[PDB]
Amino acid sequence: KKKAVAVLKGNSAVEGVVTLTQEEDGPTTVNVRITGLTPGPHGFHLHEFGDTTNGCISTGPHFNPKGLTHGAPEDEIRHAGDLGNIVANADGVAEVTIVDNQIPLTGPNAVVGRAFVVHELEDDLGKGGHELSLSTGNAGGRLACGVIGLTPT
């Protein structure tokens, strides 16, 4: 019964739309459709801030209200916005639906007014082991981002 949407833009052909649905105080369903991607897996994250005054750089780090480390969406040691990878087909198109419970549209940890970012490289899920594997996953640069806003229904 609550809904949000993010329009994803950047400097390249990578652009897309992410819709969010949440019932009850339950899981959040995320419908992701992005194009222009290099075929393969891309880091896909909900970042802390809905600030685009400085391009996608101003969206900050992965949304992490539990001071925890970077992981996979399945394992209990992740950031709230650690939504893993989205995979682009041969046409650079990634269409996927993701269900997660650390990203509510309400409550103290609402991600409303926050951001989504799709990334340059594959998320190594915090096993790289890279220096950066445990903060970012190595997902690389920020290809496109958008601020999460309220939308009808």
Under the binding rule (CB under 8 A), the answer on residue 127 touching its own copies is no
Q: Does 11 bind its own copies (CB under 8 A)?
A: yes
Contacts of its own copies in 57-86 (CB under 8 A): 57-58, 60, 65-68, 72-74, 86
Q: How far is the CB of 26 from its own copies (least distance, A)?
A: 5
DSSP letter at 62 equals B
Binding of Zn ion by 114 (CB under 5 A):
no
Q: Is 9 in the site for its own copies (CB under 8 A)?
A: yes
Both tokens of residue 150?
A: 């309220």
Residue 139 vs residues 32, 77, 82, 92, 144: alpha-carbon distances, Å: 17, 18, 11, 17, 13
Q: Is 47 a catalytic residue?
A: yes
- The Cα–Cα gap between 11 and 124 comes to 25
Q: Which residues bind Zn ion (CB under 5 A)?
A: 62, 70, 79, 82
Residues marked as catalytic: 45, 47, 62, 70, 79, 82, 119, 142
